[PDB]
Amino acid sequence: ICTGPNDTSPGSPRHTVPQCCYGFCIDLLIKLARTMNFTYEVHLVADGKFGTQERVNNSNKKEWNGMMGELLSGQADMIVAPLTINNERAQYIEFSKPFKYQGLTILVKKEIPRSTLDSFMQPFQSTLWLLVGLSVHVVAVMLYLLDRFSPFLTLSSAMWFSWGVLLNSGIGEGAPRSFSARILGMVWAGFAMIIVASYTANLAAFLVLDRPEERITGINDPRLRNPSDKFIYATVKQSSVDIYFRRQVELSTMYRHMEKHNYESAAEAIQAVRDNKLHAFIWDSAVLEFEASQKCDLVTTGELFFRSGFGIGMRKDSPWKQNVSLSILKSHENGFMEDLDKTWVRYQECDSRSNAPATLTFENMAGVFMLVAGGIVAGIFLIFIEIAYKRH
Amino acid sequence: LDRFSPFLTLSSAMWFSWGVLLNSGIGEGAPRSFSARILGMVWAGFAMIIVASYTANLAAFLVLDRPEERITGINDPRLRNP
Amino acid sequence: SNGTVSPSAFLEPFSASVWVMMFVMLLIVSAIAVFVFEYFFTIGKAIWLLWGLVFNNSVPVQNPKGTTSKIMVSVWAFFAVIFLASYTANLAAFIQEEFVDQVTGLSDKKFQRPHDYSPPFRFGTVPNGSTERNIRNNYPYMHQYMTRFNQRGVEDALVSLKTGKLDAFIYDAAVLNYKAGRDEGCKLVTIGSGYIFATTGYGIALQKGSPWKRQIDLALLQFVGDGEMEELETLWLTGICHNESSQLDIDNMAGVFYMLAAAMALSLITFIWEHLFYWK
Amino acid sequence: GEMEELETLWLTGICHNESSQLDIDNMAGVFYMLAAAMALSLIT
Ligand SMILES: CC(C)CCC[C@@H](C)[C@H]1CC[C@H]2[C@@H]3CC=C4C[C@@H](OC(=O)CCC(=O)O)CC[C@]4(C)[C@H]3CC[C@]12C
Ligand SMILES: CC(C)CCC[C@@H](C)[C@H]1CC[C@H]2[C@@H]3CC=C4C[C@@H](OC(=O)CCC(=O)O)CC[C@]4(C)[C@H]3CC[C@]12C
Ligand SMILES: CC(C)CCC[C@@H](C)[C@H]1CC[C@H]2[C@@H]3CC=C4C[C@@H](OC(=O)CCC(=O)O)CC[C@]4(C)[C@H]3CC[C@]12C
Ligand SMILES: CC(C)CCC[C@@H](C)[C@H]1CC[C@H]2[C@@H]3CC=C4C[C@@H](OC(=O)CCC(=O)O)CC[C@]4(C)[C@H]3CC[C@]12C
Ligand SMILES: CC(C)CCC[C@@H](C)[C@H]1CC[C@H]2[C@@H]3CC=C4C[C@@H](OC(=O)CCC(=O)O)CC[C@]4(C)[C@H]3CC[C@]12C
Ligand SMILES: CC(C)CCC[C@@H](C)[C@H]1CC[C@H]2[C@@H]3CC=C4C[C@@H](OC(=O)CCC(=O)O)CC[C@]4(C)[C@H]3CC[C@]12C
Ligand SMILES: Cc1nc2nc(C3CC3)nn2c(O)c1NS(=O)(=O)c1ccc(C2CCCCC2)cc1
Ligand SMILES: *[C@@H]1O[C@H](CO)[C@@H](O[C@@H]2O[C@H](CO)[C@@H](O)[C@H](O)[C@H]2NC(C)=O)[C@H](O)[C@H]1NC(C)=O
Ligand SMILES: *[C@@H]1O[C@H](CO)[C@@H](O[C@@H]2O[C@H](CO)[C@@H](O)[C@H](O)[C@H]2NC(C)=O)[C@H](O)[C@H]1NC(C)=O
Ligand SMILES: *[C@@H]1O[C@H](CO)[C@@H](O)[C@H](O)[C@H]1NC(C)=O
Ligand SMILES: *[C@@H]1O[C@H](CO)[C@@H](O)[C@H](O)[C@H]1NC(C)=O
Ligand SMILES: *[C@@H]1O[C@H](CO)[C@@H](O)[C@H](O)[C@H]1NC(C)=O
Ligand SMILES: *[C@@H]1O[C@H](CO)[C@@H](O)[C@H](O)[C@H]1NC(C)=O
Ligand SMILES: CCCCCCCCCCCC
Ligand SMILES: CCCCCCCCCCCC
Ligand SMILES: N[C@@H](CCC(=O)O)C(=O)O
Ligand SMILES: CCCCCCC
Ligand SMILES: CCCCCC
User: Fold this and answer.
1) Angle CA A33–A34–A40, to nearest 5
2) Handedness of CA D29, D35, D41, D43 (dihedral sign)
3) Is C81 at the interface with chain B, CB within 8 A?
4) Where are its TM segments located (chain D)?
5) How many CA atoms lie within 13 A of B42 on its CB side?
6) Helix or strand or coil: residue D19?
7) What is the DSSP string of B8-72?
8) B57 and C245 in contact by Cβ < 8 A?
């Protein structure tokens, strides 16, 4: 039972409603209370910020807030939460040995490919389709023009020969009789073969319109290095990653963008990334990897950087520091942290992690089936056209 | 299957199988009985798969590649670790 | 490992729904349409023609006579060329050698109970380390079996793995990762694509109550926060295999022969069935 | 080697070290072959 603020949105009366907390850190806290018998009383931090040393508008004073402030001001006694171990926080409080090793990484929206109906006509430009359609018929008529006026093939036979040779169907088993028609038809067969091969060589590529435009090569990629209006990338405001970006004097060019767009909590940032409001979210490897595993339409693309670990921070002079560190190390050595990872992090419903070429799906090639259906519904009329032609 | 049908000689069946494996059309005359009209067409699918698998990487085996020759500056593993 | 290829490797290029809708629904519907067109030559012949056109191998067929039937056969041939292009375009990558790890992890039955295996499993670790103490504390039986196949050093264990005298080597994760990276040809690899069990870290030991502890901790945290640790990892820990066309055998593509065998069985079964139907 | 790292930190680019339709000009050769076939057929 953990008593926390009711409304996450700022500017609202934050009533301390008792909710209930469960998960990795709560299980670890219960284990810690068991191994060294002390009683705990969990309460959520007042403001959603993790905690950074900020300059209050009252000048000449830096203040710790968030969980860091709640621990330093005596309101708390131990920060059992994914608190990143960094130099800035370590000067004022002492962290235990890390209970989870992770690092910063980039979460983005995995683009679901869209299958256009003209995907199979896409490899050839429409003028090429028109030209090949005209070519089929001019060759077809010229076959019988050459064959009929030959001193040494009807309309239907010539047309069927040309079309079947183009499509490789064998519908028309009528070969030309005149010599010139022989050379013409065989070179037409060769041209049809080359056209078909050139179409085939890119049909698969044009069937799935996927490109690595959104793929991010860590933080060294230009799209992160060079800010732009469209590429809106962010983190959680007032957290460890913000401290890391501010401290990096070389990466301050990134920081100018970070302060423009930031989010109150991790959930809001991942929701914004999901709803395509955001282009990239910089956050811990554990949280982002779990979100990618469960919320299946987002992908963690960034190369791992700033490797650190979550630590159970306490006060500067806390009697439990040695014992809590020893307990964390003991849990690591046997199969306890592995159990927590298995029951809280390792499980997943889908990952879509496969470097093999994408498997063709029903929604991917619906155009082919609709084209066949259109052939059905055109032939159903062509039957009546044929009987009408027979009437005359 | 066709000879002992309730209702295709050896040479014709041989030619059917050979021309189906490698598409040349020498095999003339589809199998008569239903018992062979399923096996023959599955064999056609098998032949297509075999031919496609052989074709897919024929050019790679026709001209050998150069994996080791492609040195990449001083970042080469065969340069970095002698 | 030498690797393995699944028997279905030749079947994934299309999803199961796509396969079943093309070769059951769409094809039979198109065959019925072809007959309706031609009538206005048995239905088996129409199905045979469509199936032969699906993969045109010059298999004998009986072409229809109606013009509308010929048009429908033409559009089916276009669908067939689409199918062949899509199937053969990525078949080579799909029929590829897939390397499967010998063991899932340290808790696998091969380690925990190596005796219930016809070939014994040979795994060992160097003594007098943290890994040996951890294994002794967690799995006394596994450690007792492991002491027989002990090792002298990291290089001794590596050459034992290379020759074949040893199957698995349990050791520090960072040293093993470095060895795998610097290995040539990449015959050695850590299971789980970087699986780590105890997940501790390297520390700088100090006497109890040493005055240097706090300053060293702050300095190390400043180093890791300034990106210098990444530079050092790139300079030292990075390796060769980290940054990373073959002949086809019976095991490589046995699935196609499995399909052929299933067809042989089905053909014999339907022969017996037709004999029974004719007799009765 | 400091100059190399400076030039890869500042002077490095994007287009450095970096699915197209086929129009009639790409298929010019095959159509020219077909035209030559038509001409040869007429002269024969
Ligand atoms: C849908 C887009 C891609 C254009 C496709 C055009 C074809 C569907 C049409 C156009 C012209 C049609 C041809 C024009 C006229 C001829 C002659 C025509 O002669 C007859 O009617 C008698 C046939 C017989 O009984 O032997 C037969 C169809 C046919 C080959 C047609 C076949 C179908 C054609 C090629
Ligand atoms: C190049 C490698 C792949 C080996 C090639 C084998 C061919 C040279 C042999 C093997 C089988 C032979 C065929 C097997 C049997 C047939 C039937 C056979 O019909 C007969 O009149 C003789 C037997 C009978 O009485 O039925 C005629 C040859 C022929 C086509 C054979 C032709 C030559 C074949 C194909
Ligand atoms: C009676 C005439 C119309 C022939 C009907 C064709 C079907 C009998 C064949 C053709 C394709 C076959 C399918 C092709 C591939 C799929 C996927 C396949 O799922 C997998 O990808 C592999 C799963 C595994 O690893 O076991 C399962 C069979 C199945 C449905 C097949 C089921 C039987 C199919 C439909
Ligand atoms: C003519 C029609 C009625 C039959 C069409 C053949 C296929 C639909 C059947 C025949 C054989 C079947 C295969 C035979 C056995 C294999 C292995 C079988 O076991 C595995 O691959 C699991 C993983 C592993 O063992 O490594 C999975 C199905 C599968 C691919 C089958 C998939 C479907 C197959 C190809
Ligand atoms: C009537 C049916 C039930 C059995 C006979 C079917 C046949 C069509 C044979 C011919 C070759 C046989 C294949 C040849 C040998 C292989 C290897 C065989 O064992 C291995 O995979 C290990 C590697 C190796 O044998 O070299 C597995 C079956 C299989 C696919 C066979 C499957 C059945 C095949 C296809
Ligand atoms: C046009 C006359 C000579 C009839 C004899 C040949 C014909 C079969 C046509 C059909 C298509 C014609 C081609 C279609 C259009 C191209 C573009 C065009 O190439 C250019 O240099 C101009 C730029 C452009 O329009 O793309 C002229 C040639 C060529 C290959 C044409 C060449 C003559 C083609 C092959
Ligand atoms: C812009 C666009 N957006 C789309 N969204 C979708 C989806 C998923 C539902 N399809 N789609 C498109 O197809 C287009 N392009 S189109 O309108 O110029 C167009 C229409 C129809 C055809 C033929 C294809 C062969 C069968 C008969 C219809 C070809 C081109
Ligand atoms: C931290 O753990 C140590 C070791 O369990 C505790 O020290 C023991 O305390 C009990 C009770 O006072 C004594 O009987 C033992 O003799 C102590 N052993 C050692 C090694 O000193 C210590 O009390 C724990 N402290 C906290 C913060 O709970
Ligand atoms: C691990 O430690 C043991 C000692 O605990 C080492 O055993 C010694 O080995 C040397 C050389 O063989 C002998 O001279 C000593 O008499 C041994 N002492 C004992 C008590 O056994 C062993 O060599 C060490 N192994 C490794 C690989 O470090
Ligand atoms: C407090 O929480 C309840 C849900 O338990 C919510 O309905 C209510 O609007 C909240 N009140 C505030 C602080 O607005
Ligand atoms: C904790 O355990 C000790 C025994 O080790 C016991 O005497 C004591 O009553 C327990 N309660 C607390 C919180 O001290
Ligand atoms: C300064 O901070 C206090 C406390 O948050 C706030 O009430 C006040 O409005 C702030 N004034 C300015 C000028 O921002
Ligand atoms: C395949 O694995 C066996 C051990 O099961 C090994 O003896 C053999 O050398 C391997 N094949 C190759 C490619 O060396
Ligand atoms: C007697 C038939 C002669 C036909 C000659 C056709 C030449 C086609 C050339 C295609 C080159 C790719
Ligand atoms: C006359 C009925 C013919 C049915 C042909 C079925 C062929 C199935 C082959 C499956 C290959 C994947
Ligand atoms: N890092 C290990 C190396 C020895 C081992 O893994 O057994 C240690 O100091 O204990
Ligand atoms: C408009 C005619 C299209 C023919 C396509 C042949 C592959
Ligand atoms: C009869 C011509 C059919 C063409 C389908 C694209």
Assistant:
1) 25
2) negative
3) no
4) 25-44
5) 18
6) coil
7) --HHHHHHHHHHHHTT-----S--SSHHHHHHHHHHHHHHHHHHHHHHHTHHHHHS---TTT---
8) yes
Contact C57/B47, CB-based, under 8 Å?
yes
Rounded CA Rg of chain B: 24
Q: How many Å apart are CA A35 and CA A28, to the nearest integer?
A: 11
What distance in angstroms lies between residue C31's CA and the mean position of ligand 15's atoms? Answer: 13
Q: How distant, in Å, are the alpha carbons of A68, A250, C264 from that of A54?
A: 11, 21, 77
Q: Which one of the ligands is nearest to C61 CA?
A: 15
Helix (H, G, I), strand (E, B) or coil at A324: helix
The gap from C-alpha D8 to its chain's centroid, in whole angstroms, comes to 29
Using CA atoms, how far apart are residues C27 and A256, in angstroms rounded to an integer?
Answer: 60
| Element housing A19 (H / E) | strand A16-19
Q: Report the C-alpha gap between A263 and B53 in whole angstroms.
A: 52
Kindly provide the resolution of this structure in angstroms, with one decimal: 3.1
Instruction: Give the position of tokens 């399909």.
Output: C259
Selection from A280, A296, A295 nearest residue A218 by Cα: A280
Interatomic CA distance for residues A62 and A57, integer angstroms: 10
Q: At what angle do helices A126-148 and A179-207 cross, to 10 degrees?
A: 160
DSSP code, position A227 = -
| Two structure tokens written together for A302 | 């960034």
Question: Which experimental technique did the depositors report for determining this structure?
Answer: cryo-EM
Query: Residues lining ligand 6, judged by CB closer than 6 Å?
Result: A 131; D 24-25, 28, 31, 34-35
Q: DSSP alpha helices (H): ranges in A252-365?
A: 252-258, 266-274, 285-294, 321-333, 337-341
